[PDB]
Amino acid sequence: VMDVMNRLILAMDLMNRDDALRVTGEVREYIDTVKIGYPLVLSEGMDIIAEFRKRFGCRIIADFKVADIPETNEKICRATFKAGADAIIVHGFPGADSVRACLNVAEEMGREVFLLTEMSHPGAEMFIQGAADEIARMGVDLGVKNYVGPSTRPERLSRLREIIGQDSFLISPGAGAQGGDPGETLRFADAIIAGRSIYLADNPAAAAAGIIESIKDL
């Protein structure tokens, strides 16, 4: 599995190049894995992945929550890996063919898929939560090795860890701004994602160091 420094992944959701680069550079001594999503990509272009690699040499997870039909999913994955992303995040709720399309491209291109099972926000309870255990089991059956599950619901995160097993890699958003607890989340997740609690801080480096201090025994 990927070796994520300090079990901490930066969610870089700032929407201009200058700020995104400044903050990422400020925390680079603490974090070697950066999640780049559509807020930044749709504002600055896919070449932002190239610039981050050039400036920081951090691993890049493209958080694109891929959620289309198989044919379109393949195109999205090919474009994303072409730009230099190490991995891409894909929704499971559109079903097994859509996930398999992404897995097939990742295999061909030598990259990785993360399967998003349950989400961390309140609305996830409406439809996603009731499908999540089955989505996870589907991932295991398809050979998925990397997963995303919610920091905001420790009980659900624990179940998802059970389903995927200890050898699978699990990352988790929702600690900090959304109310999850970093230490509790790391009982089950390999790494936590942190966005606003870092990038909105007066001193992002101090914020990152503080999160790390709070989980130092882990």
Ligand X SMILES: O=c1cc(O)n([C@@H]2O[C@H](COP(=O)(O)O)[C@@H](O)[C@H]2O)c(=O)[nH]1
Question: Could you list the active site residues?
Answer: 65
Candidates 120, 146, 168, 185; binder of ligand X (CB under 6 A) is 120
Sequence-distant (≥ 6) Cβ neighbours of residue 18 within 8 angstroms: none
What's the CA gap between 97 and 188, in Å, rounded?
28
| Site map (CB under 6 A) of ligand X, residues 139-178, x = contact | ---------x-x----------------------xx-xxx
CB contact burial 38-75 (16+ within 10 A = b; e otherwise): ebbbeebebebbebbbeebebbbbbbbebebebeebbe
Report residue 125: phi and psi, to 5°. -70, -20
Q: Segment 116-175, which members bind a copy of itself (CB under 8 A)?
A: 119-128, 131, 134-135, 138
201 binds a copy of itself (CB under 8 A): no
74 binds ligand X (CB under 6 A): no
101 binds ligand X (CB under 6 A): no
**Per-residue CA distances from 175 to 6, 101, 164 (Å):** 15, 31, 21
Q: Which does 193 bind (CB under 5 to 8 A by kind): ligand X, a copy of itself, none?
A: ligand X
Please report, as ranges, the residues that interact with ligand X according to CB under 6 A.
Answer: 11, 13, 37, 63, 68-69, 72, 116, 119-120, 148, 150, 173-174, 176-178, 193-197
Please report, as ranges, the residues that interact with a copy of itself according to CB under 8 A.
Answer: 13, 15, 37-39, 41-43, 45-46, 64-65, 67-70, 72, 75-76, 78-80, 83, 91-99, 119-128, 131, 134-135, 138, 178
